[PDB]
């Protein structure tokens, strides 16, 4: 666990490749990508504030440091100061790792990381630097501030979480889960969306806590403009404890953002963008979520756009509670050639939903061709760059009108035999061959029928429903539905901690399930000597992932650090339970002599045993999701998600091997867009920590020290919570 918290100097780095796709765009489309890229870039910094207390200061310090001297320039100083190269290089790694993750905690696994190097040396490198001979006040006023927490390994700072265990800036420092829950119910009572809000608890002389629910908006509480949020800014009372709904969270940043978006408007290919954008403006201005909802609908009402875009507080993964969303944004061009091979899958999508283990009344009421694309990414702001996504994240819309499916094409081209660990010399062959092609399948299904399926049972205001009660029955029980989602209630608001992992698990499982279908393979051009292989490598990869997931599980807190990995582990356990020698984990020994493991998946037993385990599973998951049954959902999940040393596996003992063979993910550098006035051009870098540093130091040529200054301030304001 020494290296759990550091980034190896040899970490792989790749540059997102988009040129052609950016070229084909005529100037109008171009700028219409441009300003969105810049807005996204502007807003993505708030992730520093949403990640760690010391993050913003770090970003400022780094940006300045490299602004004064680039990697090659600062190198000479670093080395001259007595640093061996292998040290400085590790520093560069740490900076790039803070840039890509928009913080000092990994977007994947939510674990802290520090520069690998003696502190006393970096003190030198930073102080003796050119940047410190120019503004010697700042460098010391920062280095003294964020210096330690940069390298701090103290147990409680290692992972993310509420209470004494971890660190989260979504909440104040004194908040426990109890608070997230209380304030949660309080949010659903007034039906406030938890996405854009943060909870800050405070205490007076007597031990009575008061709660500040803050919203992210450009305009803090002041004489209002007469919007929704207007009437919503006031004091409330909840169960012997006070509540206050306020706004103005990360204001100036969103100033910049709304700017760039409005600059985006006039270039819109149709009314849809030009308006939905404005809606986003409203949302990031008033702090009104509904405003984002509207533009979220418009965004699907728009189809087949040359340039695809989106932004907001969206994915809820990194909230210890699981409600509040992490800000992001993206602008990417739609590739045509690879999209048709998806649109196909959309055309025949209708049928498949009815192949799911639950009756048509347990599934969404109509259907759609919401969209499925292949996007070459230009700008993706925030902590990470997903392979594919299904949004907007509002379920209600998913059933009523629709959603969208997004397969990013050029991220793939980036991520692709001794590192094949926990496989066999066969296998890995098939793995190398079919991993890439199958990837598209698993993603298409995950996105389309993963979250595309399912239906929520909600109680509308009046005692009526969104469905017909007397005709609906639970196949597991046989009774008539006794549970549902009532007004203001939502997936995250109920399942919370599990909601993300649970849902993801469902999606992936449907992935395998339908991956077993001849049709889908015919869509991806797989059959005969082909249709085997791909399927196999897919399932095999799923079980293997189930094994690797151990790394992201914290036994001491009995807590999982990720939704996807945890879900994968769960699926693995289900398969294991199916038994019949279909799956095996063997405590082998690697050629190096150290410990090791080999995952053994009998392929012949796939349909005879595994499938049943699956559709039973899916059946249960769905069933509990429709009625929104948390008791059964958890009991069924946290049981499956439990990690112990019981044989004939001993996951507690395996986890160590998983950590020894552990991998550290690579970094994806991103290109910029420079404004020439009447023209715009693209700025690309090398694939390396250095290149990425160069990408970030050039990211904000105009306001860079201004933005740095902001982050510094916005941090200093809330410094009293941690």
């Amino acid at each position: 666990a020494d290296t759990q918290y550091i980034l190896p100097n040899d970490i792989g780095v790749s540059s997102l490749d988009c040129r052609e796709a950016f070229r084909l765009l005529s100037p109008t489309e171009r700028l219409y990508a441009y300003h969105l890229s810049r807005a996204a870039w502007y807003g993505g910094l708030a992730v520093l504030l949403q990640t760690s207390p010391e993050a913003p200061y770090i970003y400022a310090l780094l940006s300045r440091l490299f602004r004064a001297q680039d990697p090659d320039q600062l190198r000479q100083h670093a080395l001259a100061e007595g640093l061996t190269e292998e040290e400085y290089q590790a520093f560069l790694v740490y900076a790039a790792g803070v840039y890509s993750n928009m913080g000092n905690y990994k977007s994947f696994g939510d674990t802290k990381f520090v520069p690998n190097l003696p502190k006393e040396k970096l003190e030198r490198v930073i102080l003796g630097s050119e940047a410190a001979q120019q503004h010697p006040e700042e460098v010391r006023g920062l280095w003294q501030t964020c210096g330690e927490l940069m390298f701090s390994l103290e147990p409680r700072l290692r992972h993310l979480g509420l209470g004494k265990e971890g660190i989260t800036t979504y909440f104040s420092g004194n908040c426990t889960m109890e608070d997230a829950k209380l304030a949660q119910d309080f949010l659903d009572s007034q039906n406030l969306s938890a996405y854009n809000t943060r909870l800050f608890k405070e205490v007076d002389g007597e031990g009575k806590p008061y709660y500040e629910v803050r919203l992210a908006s450009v305009l803090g509480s002041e004489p209002s403009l007469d919007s929704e949020v207007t009437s919503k800014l006031k004091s409330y009372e909840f169960r012997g404890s006070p509540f206050q709904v306020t706004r103005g969270d990360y204001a100036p940043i969103l100033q910049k953002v709304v700017e760039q978006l409005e600059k985006a408007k006039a270039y819109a290919a149709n009314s849809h963008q030009g308006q939905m954008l404005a809606q986003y403006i409203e949302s990031f201005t008033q702090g009104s979520i509904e405003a984002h909802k509207r533009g979220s609908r418009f965004w699907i009402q728009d189809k087949g756009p040359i340039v695809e875009s989106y932004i907001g507080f969206i994915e809820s993964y990194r909230d210890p509670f699981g409600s509040r969303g992490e800000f992001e944004g993206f602008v990417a061009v739609v590739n045509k050639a690879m999209s048709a091979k998806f649109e196909r899958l959309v055309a025949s999508a209708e049928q498949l939903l009815k192949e799911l283990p639950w009756p048509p009344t347990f599934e969404k009421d109509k259907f759609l061709t919401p969209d499925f694309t292949s996007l070459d990414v230009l700008t993706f702001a925030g902590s990470g760059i997903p392979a594919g996504i299904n949004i907007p994240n509002y379920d209600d819309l998913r059933q009523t009108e629709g959603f969208k499916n997004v397969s990013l094409g050029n991220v793939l081209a980036v991520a692709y035999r001794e590192k094949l660990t926990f496989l066999e010399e066969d296998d890995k062959d098939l793995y190398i061959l079919w991993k890439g092609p199958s990837f598209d399948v698993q993603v298409g299904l995950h996105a389309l029928l993963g979250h595309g399926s399912g239906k929520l049972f909600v109680q509308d205001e009046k005692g009526a429903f969104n469905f017909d009660q007397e005709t609906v029955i639970n196949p597991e029980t046989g009774e008539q539905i006794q549970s549902w989602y009532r007004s203001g209630e939502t997936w995250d608001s109920k399942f919370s901690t599990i909601a993300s992992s649970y849902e993801e698990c469902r999606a992936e499982s449907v992935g395998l399930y339908l991956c077993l279908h001849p049709q889908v393979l015919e869509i991806f051009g797989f059959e005969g000597a082909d249709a085997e292989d791909v399927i196999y490598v897919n399932w095999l990869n799923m079980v293997r992932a189930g094994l690797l997931a151990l790394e992201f599980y914290t036994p001491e807190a009995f807590n999982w650090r990720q939704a996807h990995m945890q879900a994968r582990f769960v699926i693995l356990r289900v398969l294991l339970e199916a038994g019949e020698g279909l799956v095996t984990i063997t405590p082998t020994t690697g050629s190096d002599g150290r410990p090791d493991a080999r995952v053994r998946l009998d392929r012949s037993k796939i349909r005879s045993v595994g499938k049943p385990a699956l559709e039973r599973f899916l059946r249960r998951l769905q069933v509990l999701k429709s009625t929104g049954d948390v008791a059964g959902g958890r009991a069924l999940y946290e049981g499956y998600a439990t990690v112990t040393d019981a044989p004939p596996e001993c996951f507690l003992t395996l986890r160590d091997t998983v950590l020894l063979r552990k991998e550290s993910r690579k970094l994806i550098v991103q290109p910029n867009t420079r404004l020439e006035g009447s023209d715009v051009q693209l700025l690309e870098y090398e694939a390396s920590a250095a290149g990425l540093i160069r990408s970030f130091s050039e990211r904000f040529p105009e306001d860079g020290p201004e933005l740095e200054e902001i982050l510094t301030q916005l941090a200093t304001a809330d410094a009293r919570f941690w």
Binding site: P386, I389, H451
Partner: peptide, 5 residues
């Protein structure tokens, strides 16, 4: 909602 690489 995200499916990672």
């Amino acid at each position: 909602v995200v499916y990672p690489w």
